[PDB]
Structures are given as C-alpha cells and as structure tokens.
Write a protein that binds this ligand. Structure first.
Ligand SMILES: [Mg+2]
Ligand SMILES: [Mg+2]
Lengths: 467, 467
C-alpha cells in the first residue's frame, strides 16, 4: 500500500475523545506528533494552515500519475517526441527532496553538506568511483541555484521521475547523440538545462493554464483524502485561539477543495448541523505567494467571493466577518489577528516556503506535515533489523558489508531510498526538518490527540565539550 | 586568570611523546580535540593553517586593551569628545559573538533562531518585558546585515566593549539628548548606526593605517603566545601530508609574527638545528581575503620576499620552492597541492570566514580554534553545580528560580555570559560551531596528542521518529 492509503485508513476512523483512548492512540508512531524543539501549546494563540498537501492531501499514486500524464502531453504538444507518450508513472522510482543537476542531467540525493549519497543518470545508478569524474570531491554547492534544483515538494514527484525517463530515453534513442551536457540531434542541441526548464514550465502550465485542477475537482474521491475529524480539530482550536488559512492557491480552487474537505452530513461531530468551511476560520487568505509572503509580500487584495475575481484596488479595511483576502504578507496575519510570531503555529508541508521561511524571517512556530511519513514509519519498524545490522557493523570497525547492507535497507523504501537517509547518512531534507520544523507528523490531525495544554518536550542540546 | 594565561601555561610545557603520556594528556578537557562529525585523520592529505588567533594567539587582556586604546584615540582624533580618553578596557564586560543592533544601539546575545537571550543598552541590561518595546517578538532577523552586525572575532572584543562605553557615555552626558535611534546635540544628530560605522572604521584604520601592528611587533612577548611544540606538530604533519598557510594578513606582518612563533634555539625538538618558519610549509599564502577566497577569490600574485612588495602582474607559474603567494583562491591550494576539499583539514578561529565558508562553498574539513575555551572549560567544570541545579529545575516543572539560577551561572563567565549559552539556551555561536566545525579545540596544538591514524568519532544522528 501507499502512504496516502495509510493516511486515508486513519481518516475513515471516528474520533474517540475519551482521554485514555487519546493517550493510548498517540503513543503509536502513526498518530504521534514528533518534537525537534520544545513547544508549549498553551502559548499558541493562532493556528494557521496551508491547504495543498496539508489539509488537502492528494491520493497517491493517482494524483502524481495524473500530473505526469498531463506534463508529458504538454511536452509532446510543444514538439517533444511521441515516445514520451509510452512513459507511465512509476511510484517506486522517485523519492522527494532530490537535486536535479542541470549541467550533467543527474538526480542527486545529498546530505546537509552537499555530499553525494546517490547519483542516478536516467535509471543508471552511478557508483562511488564513477561520480568523481563529474563531482571530483563528491560534493555540490547547493546554493548554486542556477545549476542545482531541489525537488522539495510532493508536486515535484512526477517531474523527478519524468526527468529520469527523459534522460534514459534520449540516451538510448539512436536519433540522439549523448554529450557531456546534453543531447545532439543533427543541427539541434538540447542541453539538460533547457530540457529541465521545459519540464518545469510544463508542470507549472499544467497546474495553471492546463486541465489538472479541473480533472482533480471533477473526481475528488479519486484524488483527495477526506477526514471527518478536520472540523472537530478546527472547532476545538477555535475554542482556545484563532484559526487561519494561508494558501498559495486561488479562491476558486480553494473553495472547491475546502468544500469537499468539509462535505459530511455533520459539523464538528456526528449529529451536529453541517457548517460552511469558511466558518471555521477567523482569517482566510489565498494567492499567498509563499515564501515572498514572509517578507515584503504583495499588495493586500480582497476577493469577490461571488465572482471569484479580485476587487479592483488594494484593500484598506479591517477584518470583517466573511471577507477573504488575496496576497499581502505575514504581517497582515499578525496585525489583523493581533499576534506575534511566537503566538502562531503554522502548519504546512513545504519545508522551504512554509517552515524554513516562516521560522527564519519571522520567528513563527512551525509544524511540518510529511505525508510520506505514514509509510516511511512502517518500513523503519518492520526493517529495523537491517538498520540495526548496519548500526552494529559501524561499531565493529570501531566496509564492503556496510555498502551492501546500506543498499538493502534503502531499497525497501524505493529506488531512491528513504526520504530521510541513505543508510547511516541523513539527507538534506532530514537535516532541515530537524533544523526548522519545531514539530512534525505524518498528518496535522495528529494534533487532535493532544490537549491544548500539552508541553511538547525535547531534551536540551549539549555541545561535545559540555557532555 | 585569563584564557591566554591558560594557553600560555600549556605552551611553556615540553611535549612528552611517550604514547601512554599522550593518551592520558588528551583525555583532560584542556588538551582534548572535540568532534561534531566523525573525521578519519588518515584521509587528511593537507593541513592548512590560519595565522591570527590561530597560530598567533594574542595575549589577553593586553592585546584587546591595546586595540581599544588605539581605537579610542583614533576616534578622539576625528572629533569624538575627550571623555572617551577616560575609558579603559574591561575584559569582564564583552563576550564574543554579540550582535550590535545599529537601529536601537543595543548589544544582543541571540540563539540560532534570532531569539533574544540578553539585551544591553550601554551597561543597562534590559529585562524580558522591557525588550518587547523594541523587539515585539523577542527576535531579530539576523540576515538583515544592514541593521545587525555580529561581532564574531576576538578582534571585535575591544569594539564590543567600546560600543557599550559609548552608548553609556552619551546617554548619561548632559550635552546630549537621547532619542530612539541615536543622540541629539543641538543641530547635530548622531544615529547609533553612524556611531557604529565610525567605531568599525577606526578599528580597521588602527589595524591597517595606524600603529597597532608596529606596537605588537615591538613587544611580541607581551602580545603573542609562543609554544615550542608548534614546530614539532608541523614537522610531524609534513611526514604524512602537505602543510599550508593561508592568512588574511600581509607578508611583512606574517613574517615578523611567524619568525617570533618559531624563535627557539631549536627546530622541531630540543637539540635539533633551528630552521626558518617558511621551511615548515609546502605553500604559503597571504592577503587571502577570506571568505571571498572560498569563491571567486582574487588574482594570484607573487610576493617579492626581499622587498615585501608584490611583483607586478598575475603569477602564472607553478609551485616553486620558496615562492610566497598573495591573493588567489581556495582552488589555488587545491590545484597546486593536488588535493580535493575532503583531503584538506583547514584550522582557524573565524567561525564565518574560515569554517562556515570553507565547509559550505568548498566541502573542506574544518577544525575551529576557540581560544576562550581554555577558560570556558574551567568554569563549566568548577560551576557544574549551578548548571546541574538548572538542569534539575527544568525537569521538576516537567520558573522565577529558573531565571535567578540562569543569571548566577552566566555571571561566572562575565557580564555577557558564556560564549556558548545563556543558561539552557545555546547561542548562535554554539549552534554554528556544532553545524560547521567538524572538530574544535581550545588550541590547534591539541592535534599533537593524537596519532595521524586516529578516528575522531561522533555518534550518528537520529530524528525524533527514528529514536
Ligand atoms: Mg502545501
Ligand atoms: Mg584568524
């Protein structure tokens, strides 16, 4: 099964708010909130939510497969070869947080320090010695954003795989000659960089100018996890604080998704009257443009909720009941809900644009949703054997077996391994989760299972000379 | 006593290279190398050294007091008031790694996340509630380099204290009216920012156009720690690898300092012939301009070692015996010593310009010298009681006593507390040591006490969900 299967299984369950049931439930990994830094919930005055891959978790592999399919069609449409059409999305290939090197056309799994853990060129996994040809120090300068692109979001799962399909196809298609930095077809040269830009633009185009959204919304059961405990959680938050939505997506789409998310015969709990999704929020903001939202932002606009268009002009009014904002900045939230950054818990899946940025620019408290965790956890438990074997093989040498066992652990997760590590080496992703997510979970719903008085605790950190 | 007292005490001792003596010596905190990330020394092919506050550790408080005294004289010289002349350097005030806020004229001790641990305005320590006036979220955006300056080096110890003297003097001098962002004297307005720039320029001027260097070199016993084990360590490194000097300072100064550093009746060991400092290095480079050195660098020049001037032109030749370089880049070192970044251990005291930058830009291995550690360690041991009391007071509540005990621990270190923490809260400095220094010690000489085969080990890191 998939991580969205695990999530949706848990979603289909009623909430048993009996306090002993709660305590028991959240000691189970699947339902636990994990803590990187201590957070006293009683201090949180505003709970803020992201929408895509946070409140609205898209079913896998269905959604990735749709995105891939329409990206490929867009590319064939602009003149890429018909062979593309025979590609089919494969969920066992891509892991999130990979770096596409646009110079050399490789996918890299790196650690926090730019060190190379895995290198695939198409579907060929390049081993240690061979990577030194292009990476003399087995290292990339990942801030070199012109050359290196980090495929940080679940939205990038289909393109991670498509990049590899395309490198593989051109490499092995006799019409094209492979060169260091791209492919020659007679008098046309396609660099990996230009190829990469096309894929990137086509993904954007599918989400913005194409048919992805329309196809999602016309079959919401197929594409979006739904959970009757969402209204319960939000109603409970609203009892102790303020709740807000801040989404990069536009009004029309947010309304269709959010309406689905709340589409039950009842309100917070079974038996209670249904109420519109907007009622659960003290402030609703779309077209956020995160991460820029956490700095200068853009001009504050007001949505005409009847037409779905923006009113003409900058909005200069106060928080009214029923107003929906567009644009603005993180200061809009603070000022209008009368909060300081440390009074806000923002909940989101984008490690960069939701968590890193809110934490560094603004000192918000952060909760990261990691939808893959719901399944990464089952693997970590079931194959704790291998990791233990590896753990123990590092102490006995304190070599070829370290390498063989690493590969066997990593393969259980997929061709590109755990989101969090390659053997004993932690990924950039893992290290940024630890660095900037105060709390993290497989789902935001795991907060339901903790009283609002709860103190999420982490042990104090000590330097080597201090221990 | 001072940290340089501790260092010089250890320096005055001969090396007992008996292997059992070695093992014993380095288990003592003062002589230990501390490990943030595992490092196999057998992999290191080049050992690179910084000079100022690394090889050449300046005696405290003598050196800071000299710098302060000449900075103050420079300022009076350009028209600051004669009262400045009655200031005298006080070593118990400043801690390294403070942030001067140029808007409000405060010194801040912050954590990795910009959270405020201490705020002093002149010598007035502003408590929790009062800091919310200027810092509504008790937080600064430390990347806002136009507003916030981090006083990261031992060279900045005198200016940290001078900033506070000056804020205190203008505040309490009846000629000046204190405003939010600076001081009014009739028709002249002095912002904290313009004041700060003057101090900063005057420090630069003292080091570059003034008399600090001349006064150092005319009394090297007073101002610079010297240790007969330096040549031993370097000779031993040269047996297993290549040794290089890369200093921001110029040739003439480097030669006077380095000659002092090696001024013993003997060479590597007692009884052996003395040899010139340059003989210990496979590559010597001055005017490095770190951190830019770790990127594009500057043009490679060759020093005329007879005149102390640079030859005219870019140097296009190979590594020759006896050549001294100026400028260039980190690639100069790699290319000319035929090394890759992970074959280099660079040793230095500048957390930013030596360690952070070499690690992020180039993947060098890093050893940070923390000269204050030689004394920070004695306090941590002797007052382990207080920290233990605090440690234990955090678990019993798992408040006013947490706060009172924090202050008593921090005061043992100075008015601005440990370099590494304020109570249980770790400083930005501490967190960057952990993040970018693979190894660290109170002195580079602590490497002497470890065989070159040694494996510096750190335990593998696990995420909360993995433990
Ligand atoms: Mg999202
Ligand atoms: Mg230095």
């Amino acid at each position: 099964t998939s991580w969205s299967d695990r999530l949706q299984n848990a979603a289909d369950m009623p909430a048993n708010m009996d306090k002993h049931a709660l305590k028991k439930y959240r000691r189970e990994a699947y339902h636990r909130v994990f803590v990187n830094r201590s957070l006293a919930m009683e201090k949180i005055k505003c709970f803020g939510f992201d929408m895509d891959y946070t409140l609205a978790v898209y079913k896998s592999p269905e959604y990735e497969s749709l995105g891939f399919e329409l990206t490929v069609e867009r590319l064939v449409s602009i003149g890429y070869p018909q062979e593309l059409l025979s590609f089919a999305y494969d969920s066992t290939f891509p892991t999130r947080g990979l770096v596409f090197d646009t110079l050399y056309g490789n996918l890299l799994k790196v650690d926090a320090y730019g060190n190379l853990l895995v290198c695939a060129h198409g579907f060929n996994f390049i081993r240690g010695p061979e990577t030194r040809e292009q990476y003399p120090n087995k290292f990339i300068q990942r801030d070199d954003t012109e050359r290196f692109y980090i495929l940080n979001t679940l939205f990038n799962l289909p393109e991670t795989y498509l990049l590899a399909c395309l490198v593989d196809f051109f490499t092995n298609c006799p019409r094209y000659t492979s060169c260091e930095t791209g492919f020659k077809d007679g008098d046309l040269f396609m660099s990996y960089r230009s190829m990469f830009q096309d894929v990137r633009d086509a993904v954007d185009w599918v989400h913005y100018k194409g048919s992805l959204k329309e196809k999602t919304v016309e079959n919401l059961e197929k594409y979006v996890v739904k959970d009757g405990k969402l209204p319960l959680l939000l109603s409970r938050m609203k009892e102790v604080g303020k709740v807000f939505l801040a989404t990069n997506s536009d009004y029309k789409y947010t309304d269709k998704i959010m309406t689905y998310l709340f589409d039950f015969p009842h309100g917070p709990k079974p038996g209670s009257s249904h109420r519109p999704w907007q009622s659960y929020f003290d402030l609703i903001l779309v077209d956020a443009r995160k991460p820029l939202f956490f700095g200068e932002g853009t001009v504050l606009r007001q949505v005409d909720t009847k037409t779905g268009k923006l009113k003409i002009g900058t909005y200069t009014g106060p928080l009214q009941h029923g107003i929906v904002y567009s644009g603005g900045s993180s200061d809009t939230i603070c000022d209008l809900l009368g909060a300081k950054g440390k009074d806000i818990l923002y909940i989101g899946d984008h490690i960069f644009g939701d968590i890193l940025k809110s934490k560094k620019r603004q000192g918000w408290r952060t909760f990261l949703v990691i939808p893959e965790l719901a399944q990464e956890l089952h693997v970590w438990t079931d194959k704790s054997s291998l990791f233990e074997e590896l753990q123990s093989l590092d102490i006995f040498l304190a070599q070829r077996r370290i390498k063989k066992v690493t590969h066997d652990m990593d393969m259980c997760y997929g061709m590109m391994g755990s989101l969090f590590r390659s053997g004993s080496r932690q990924t950039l992703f893992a290290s940024q989760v630890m660095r900037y997510a105060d709390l993290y979970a497989a789902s935001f719903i795991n907060l339901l299972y903790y009283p609002f008085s709860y103190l999420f605790r982490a042990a104090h950190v000590l330097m080597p000379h201090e221990s």
